[PDB]
Amino acid sequence: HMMLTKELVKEAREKAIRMLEKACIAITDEEKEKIEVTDFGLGVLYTFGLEILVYVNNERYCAKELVMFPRQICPEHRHPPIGSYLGKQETFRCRWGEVYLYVPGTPTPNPRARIPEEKKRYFTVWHEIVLRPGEQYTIPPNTLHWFQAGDEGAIVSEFSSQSIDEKDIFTDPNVKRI
Amino acid sequence: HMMLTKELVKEAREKAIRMLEKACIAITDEEKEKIEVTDFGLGVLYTFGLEILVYVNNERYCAKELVMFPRQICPEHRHPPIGSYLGKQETFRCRWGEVYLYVPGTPTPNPRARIPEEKKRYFTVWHEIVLRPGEQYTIPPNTLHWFQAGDEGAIVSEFSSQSIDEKDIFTDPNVKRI
Ligand SMILES: OC[C@H]1O[C@@H](O)[C@@H](O)[C@@H](O)[C@@H]1O
Ligand SMILES: OC[C@H]1O[C@@H](O)[C@@H](O)[C@@H](O)[C@@H]1O
Ligand SMILES: [Mn+2]
Ligand SMILES: [Mn+2]
């Protein structure tokens, strides 16, 4: 249950690099140094965390590679409207492994995800979309969602409207995105 | 110098599938059937052509995979403003192979591309950007550009504002996009 040190960040960045290269996704040396490692401020990176390569992000489009270690969870959040921006719409495409995405709707029986008991209160949507390599789903703006990688981890691509991560809203009050 | 038949389209679609899978890019069966094969209406697909998988294309963002056979050329074009749309801005990322992209600016000496004599009149920009796997370049709207794959072909990803291919403007008057 540790604060996010320089050394933990390095270890996670190197692991995400290994995963990307094993999936045959080429990345430049400059990109290797720029991969973002977030524990969402929750201090258990291998439980709640994401390792992110931003390919491009501007007002007109965004694309990222979201690397997830085995059973890593992205905590529940929504990309809200901000001023006259509608909020981010995103399409996820699983490239490698598998991911369990949860969105609003009828609760899926026998969900695949496993959430710590202490954190169950912070997952409110339970309609399951399982994505395997090549499969996609689109999330409209201001929609609560979260995801957990399967037992071998996942690489999930994002194609989206502009990303403004600083303005995301997280169900878990403990989360600090940056 | 042949019209684009059902059989030529099938052959090219299958070759693009082989290339995608060799590059470890997963694609679904439905996507395999939906890959677009265009000879730009010029009747020499292996000289001028593109094989395209659209991942997603809506008013807020677009992402595609552009598959190019060895030395296949995308003829020169620009994505213009249309009404109050600025025109498409796109970022290209080479995933596999290599591609020679040409944009406006100072002519690059010793360009890598090889253009048929009959078609040289239709390439007006000659500032070369070579992209190898992992490398990117961004093209602003209404900018003339064209590209040729290297000797082993290329897979180039596009991340872009919405795509409206029907409205592209091509230097070569012979081109019919669809
Ligand atoms: O903000 C947390 C993360 O949420 C995921 O769903 C994606 O939207 C990422 O782009 C983002 O960085
Ligand atoms: O229209 C021809 C093609 O031009 C390429 O540069 C890309 O912009 C493709 O998306 C497009 O289909
Ligand atoms: Mn999201
Ligand atoms: Mn273009």
Q: Mind listing the domains of chain A with CATH numbers?
A: 6-170 (2.60.120.10)
Token couple for B49 = 């052509």
Pairwise CB contact (< 8 Å): A161 & B61: yes
User: By the 8 A CB rule, do B121 and B100 touch?
Assistant: no
Q: Does A135 touch chain B (CB under 8 A)?
A: yes
CA distance B86 to B70: 33
Q: Measuring CA to CA, how many Å separate B60 from each of A57, A64, A101, A102, A139?
A: 13, 16, 22, 23, 13
Q: Measuring CA to CA, how many Å separate A116 from each of A13, A51, A102, A120, B151?
A: 24, 20, 16, 6, 52
- What's the gap in Å between the CA of A93 and the closest CA on chain B? 9
Name residue, tokens 């995800």.
A113
Give phi and psi for B43, each to the nearest 5.
75, 15
Which atom of ligand 2 is the closest one to the Cα of B52? 12
User: By the 8 A CB rule, do B32 and A131 touch?
Assistant: no
Pairwise CB contact (< 8 Å): B134 & A31: yes
CA A6 to chain centroid, in Å, comes to 21
Q: Of A87, A82, A72, give the one whose Cα is nearest residue A146.
A: A72
Token couple for A13 = 């960045």
Q: Which residues of B touch A56 (CB under 8 A)?
A: 91, 136, 138, 159
Instruction: Quickly count: other Cβ atoms within 10 Å of residue B75's Cβ.
Output: 24
Q: Closest-lying ligand to the alpha carbon of B167?
A: 2
User: By the 8 A CB rule, do A137 and A161 touch?
Assistant: no
User: By the 8 A CB rule, do A40 and A170 touch?
Assistant: yes
Token couple for A143 = 């929609």
Which A-chain residues 112-131 have CB contacts (< 8 A) with chain B?
none
Token couple for B169 = 């403007």
User: By the 8 A CB rule, do B92 and B157 touch?
Assistant: yes
**Residue ranges of the alpha helices (H) in chain B?**
6-22, 29-34
- Give the distance (Å) from ligand 1 centre to CA of residue A166: 10
Which atom of ligand 2 is the closest one to the Cα of B64? 10
Find the residues whose C-beta lies inside 6 A of ligand 1: A 52, 64, 74, 77, 90, 158, 163, 165, 168, 177
Q: Of B159, B36, B139, give the one whose Cα is nearest residue B80.
A: B139
Give phi and psi for A30, each to the nearest 5.
-65, -40
Pairwise CB contact (< 8 Å): B55 & A134: no
Q: Measuring CA to CA, how many Å separate A110 from each of A114, A126, A154, B138?
A: 11, 10, 21, 45
Smallest Cβ–Cβ distance between A55 and the set B58, B89, B136 belongs to B136
Contacts of B48 (CB under 8 A, 6+ apart): B39, B40, B42, B72, B73, B74, B75, B119
- For this PDB entry, the determination method is X-ray
Token couple for A34 = 């720029």
- Give the distance (Å) from ligand 2 centre to CA of residue B107: 22
Q: Of A95, A3, A142, A81, give the one whose Cα is nearest residue B157.
A: A95
DSSP B12: H
Q: Does B33 touch chain A (CB under 8 A)?
A: no
CA distance B83 to B97: 37
Annotated binding residue A177: yes
DSSP A46: T
Helix (H, G, I), strand (E, B) or coil at A156: strand
Instruction: Quickly count: other Cβ atoms within 10 Å of residue B146's Cβ.
Output: 24
Q: Which residues of A touch B134 (CB under 8 A)?
A: 26-28, 31
User: By the 8 A CB rule, do A29 and B135 touch?
Assistant: no
Does the beta carbon of B163 lie inside 6 Å of ligand 2?
A: yes
Contacts of A33 (CB under 8 A, 6+ apart): none
Helix (H, G, I), strand (E, B) or coil at B138: strand
Give the pairing of strands A169-170 and A145-160.
unpaired
Pairwise CB contact (< 8 Å): A91 & B61: yes
CA distance B49 to B40: 6
- What's the gap in Å between the CA of A134 and the closest CA on chain B? 5
Token couple for B85 = 């749309």
